[PDB]
Design a protein around this ligand. Structure first.
Ligand SMILES: COc1ccc(CN)cc1OC
Length: 281
């Protein structure tokens, strides 16, 4: 059981070394569409690109590019869209993707400002009475209700397709307490947040894939969908020990580069999964 492997890596302090093996073993696939010069202003970081094979395509015929990847975990029957925090000029694209993919939830793992810089556009309304219209994509977005708690906020949004007058209810799950530097001391609140998302049905196969992001959509977003997938495989399987967090992470990396940015995030994922199991007993 990984619990023993955890103590071993921890007692030897081999985390940086484990992490480097994963870096070296990780897939590399073309990302030609991301690097086209017409798409330069659709990427927040020049070194974080979706692979062409797993990129989400917008159904607008002009330019179908968005920095988003579909991560399909076949065994766990789970899918996720990892994307970057939208830019001022991609908020309309972001909501179009949510519409086109029939997503039920958006999980946000960053504050709009961290380290005194902007990590993300304000892409949802702040007040009931002040809805947002995206002109470029013919979508209207309305805050319905907002439920602020210590570690996270849940918002009920209405997304209206102005073209067809269809409306959908979107859930916004905003983990608001990820520290500016490093990782939470305890995974307790992250695990509570994860289950809250599960309970909503946002991760369920009767809906399009959940959209998950931080600023880049590889670090904290990686930790979210690594933990969800590992915990799900632990119920699914005859034998728990089978599930190897390093194998699951490398399988996820075939879909999006860089998932889990630091050895700290690797250690924290182990801790979340180990603790997360401990709540099954
Ligand atoms: C019958 O449905 C499922 C069975 C197993 C898993 C996960 N291994 C997910 C499912 O989705 C509902």
């Amino acid at each position: 059981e990984m619990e023993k492997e955890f103590e071993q890596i921890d007692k030897s302090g081999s985390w940086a070394a484990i992490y480097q093996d994963i870096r070296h073993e990780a897939s590399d696939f073309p990302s030609r569409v991301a690097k086209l010069p017409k798409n330069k202003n659709r990427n927040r970081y020049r070194d974080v690109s979706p692979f062409d094979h797993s990129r989400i395509k917008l159904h607008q015929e002009d330019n179908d590019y968005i920095n988003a990847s579909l991560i399909k975990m076949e065994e766990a029957q789970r899918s996720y869209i990892l994307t970057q925090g939208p830019l001022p000029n991609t908020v309309g694209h972001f909501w179009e993707m949510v519409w086109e993919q029939k997503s039920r939830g958006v999980v946000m793992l960053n504050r709009v400002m961290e380290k005194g810089s902007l990590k993300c556009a304000q892409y949802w309304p702040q007040k009931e009475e002040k809805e947002m219209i995206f002109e470029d994509t013919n979508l209207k977005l309305t805050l319905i209700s907002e439920d602020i708690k210590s570690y996270y906020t849940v918002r009920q949004l209405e997304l209206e397709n102005l073209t067809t007058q269809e409306t959908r209810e979107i859930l916004h799950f905003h983990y608001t307490t990820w520290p500016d530097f490093g990782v939470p001391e305890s995974p307790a609140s992250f695990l509570n947040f994860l289950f809250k998302v599960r309970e909503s049905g946002s991760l369920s196969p009767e809906h399009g894939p959940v959209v998950v992001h931080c600023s880049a959509g590889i670090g904290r977003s990686g930790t979210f969908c690594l933990a969800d997938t590992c915990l799900l495989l632990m119920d699914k399987r005859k034998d728990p020990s089978s599930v190897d967090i390093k194998k699951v992470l490398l399988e996820m990396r075939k879909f999006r580069m860089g998932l889990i940015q630091t050895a700290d995030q690797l250690r924290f994922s182990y801790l979340a999964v180990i603790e997360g199991a401990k709540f099954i007993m």
